[PDB]
Amino acid sequence: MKGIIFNVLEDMVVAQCGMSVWNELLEKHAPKDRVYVSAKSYAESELFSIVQDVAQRLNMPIQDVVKAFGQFLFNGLASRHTDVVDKFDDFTSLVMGIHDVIHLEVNKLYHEPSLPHINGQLLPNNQIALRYSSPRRLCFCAEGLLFGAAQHFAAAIQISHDTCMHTGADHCMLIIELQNDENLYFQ
Ligand code: HEM
Ligand code: NA
Ligand SMILES: [Zn+2]
């Protein structure tokens, strides 16, 4: 898990809970004097432990917290990698380019990142079938990231998530409906 994910998580926790809470989280779930260098890899368990702690503190379902983080995370990534996101002029283009363009770039930007396998298929009625697979099973982070991407393009979406690794499948199917964006008028 790359430090950049931890850095954006810090921004979120500091904004919601305060720096005092982040320092508690860091002291408890990470070794002494831990500093997350953006490009460096760290144990994903450190991230999960922190996020689980946050969920418990807020009395929220863990997957709702991960989804919220995902949405916050897209802007964190877009602002740190503006050149990557500026490759796309709309939401649908970006989603279809997650695997072959965005995460391909991430492999050039970072040393041996741990990334999901994603494949998007354009459907009728302005829908996208996004197939997600990963041993980390962060499909709800993916959901959040998609809502973040929609927000980035001033678009509105809905997601159906009825095939899921957490309900026993070896992949998740995220069915994305584009309800509105700047090029969508009546239909
Ligand atoms: C809707 C858009 C996106 C989706 C659905 C998505 C999906 C994901 C997910 C779910 C993860 C967690 C790892 C896993 O599931 O195995 C991940 C990791 C990551 N993604 Fe994306 N992502 C999106 C956009 C971006 C963008 C715009 C960037 C940067 C330009 C980016 C760079 C990264 C990086 C650096 C990691 C961490 C890799 C590691 O820790 O080794 N992603 N992505
Ligand atoms: Na519109
Ligand atoms: Zn899932």
**180: CATH:** 3.90.1520.10
Residue 134 labelled as part of a binding site: yes
For residue 2, the ligand 1 atom closest to its alpha carbon is 40
Could you tell me if the CB of 146 is within 6 A of ligand 1?
A: yes
- Nearest residue (CA) to ligand 1, atom 21: 103
Angle at 178 between CA 176 and CA 184, to 5 degrees: 165
CB distance 115 to ligand 1 below 6 Å: yes
For ligand 3, the distance from its centroid to the CA atom of residue 68, given in whole angstroms, is 15
DSSP string across the chain: -BHHHHHHHHHHHHHHT-HHHHHHHHHHHS-TT----TTSB--HHHHHHHHHHHHHHHT--HHHHHHHHHHHHHHHHHHHSHHHHTT-SSHHHHHHTIIIIIHHHHHHHSSS----EEEEEEETTTEEEEEEE-TT--HHHHHHHHHHHHHHTT-EEEEEEEE-GGGT-SSEEEEEEEEE-TT-S--
Give the Å distances, CA to CA, from 39 to 5, 42, 111, 168.
Answer: 10, 10, 8, 33
Expressed in Å, this structure's resolution amounts to 2.0
Is there a binding annotation on residue 185?
no
Split into its structural domains, the chain has a count of: 1
- Establish whether residue 67 lines the binding site of ligand 1, counting it when its CB lies within 6 angstroms of any ligand atom: no
174 in contact with ligand 1, CB cutoff 6 A? no
Q: Which atom of ligand 1 is nearest to the CA of 113?
A: 41
Question: Does residue 79 have its Cβ closer than 6 Å to ligand 1?
Answer: no
Q: Which residues of 68-94 are buried (b: 16+ CB within 10 A; e: fewer)?
A: bbbbbbbbbbbeeeeebbeebebbbeb
Enclosing domain of residue 39: 1-187
